[PDB]
Ligand binder design. Sequence first.
Ligand SMILES: C[C@H]1CC[C@@H](O)[C@H]1NC(=O)[C@H](Cc1ccccc1)C[C@H](O)CN1CCN(C(=O)c2cnc(N3CCN(C)CC3)c(Cl)n2)C[C@H]1C(=O)NC(C)(C)C
Lengths: 99, 99
Amino acid sequence: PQITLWQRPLVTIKIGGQLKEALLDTGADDTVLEEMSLPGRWKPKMIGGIGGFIKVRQYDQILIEICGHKAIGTVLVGPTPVNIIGRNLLTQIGCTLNF
Amino acid sequence: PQITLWQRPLVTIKIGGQLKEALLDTGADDTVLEEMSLPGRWKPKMIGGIGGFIKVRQYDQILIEICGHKAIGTVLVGPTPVNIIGRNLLTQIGCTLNF
Ligand SMILES: C[C@H]1CC[C@@H](O)[C@H]1NC(=O)[C@H](Cc1ccccc1)C[C@H](O)CN1CCN(C(=O)c2cnc(N3CCN(C)CC3)c(Cl)n2)C[C@H]1C(=O)NC(C)(C)C
């Protein structure tokens, strides 16, 4: 699909059998999700946004469907204002910017 | 052009005579730039994201040239770690997300 930016690019994602809303974010290197329970072990990671750095939990090889497109990759879980789909997963679904 | 997301989507922008590097950010509602002087009056504003909120100066109707394309809009100036071009300006240059 072609998505214009007059409105926030929110899409529906499916993770852990649940539907959630997430933002297609080209300015985010990583994918960061709000607090939830994910399988396996986690590693620590510090990530910096606009207001500073936060601590998140890193989970690898997590399956997540974005608009019907399956992706499997690294997801970070921490205190985020909204679920964010970053470049690591945007590249998997073949997302590009055009103008 | 067609920009891929393997690397951060940086582009050259021109504002107030100066040439700067900036991120094409679909996740950002606003355009935030690193400390600089812009003509006219400003209004104080707090913008937030991951890591918290920062205080910025809101300048309205500023002209920016993003890859040759001219655009007019509100620009926020403050202690951001990177120059970011948000949706308010991305729409003006006809930027879309495709996949
Ligand atoms: C994800 C991290 C991984 C590693 C880094 O790559 C990283 N990226 C980022 O953080 C980049 C910046 C960056 C890039 C490289 C290096 C350092 C920093 C910004 C990010 O792309 C967008 N980000 C998405 C979440 N988000 C919201 O949903 C949101 C929306 N609205 C809000 N509200 C709620 C209603 N209110 C009325 C009004 C305020 C609030 Cl608080 N928050 C804030 C927004 C943001 O920051 N917007 C701006 C205008 C402030 C810029």
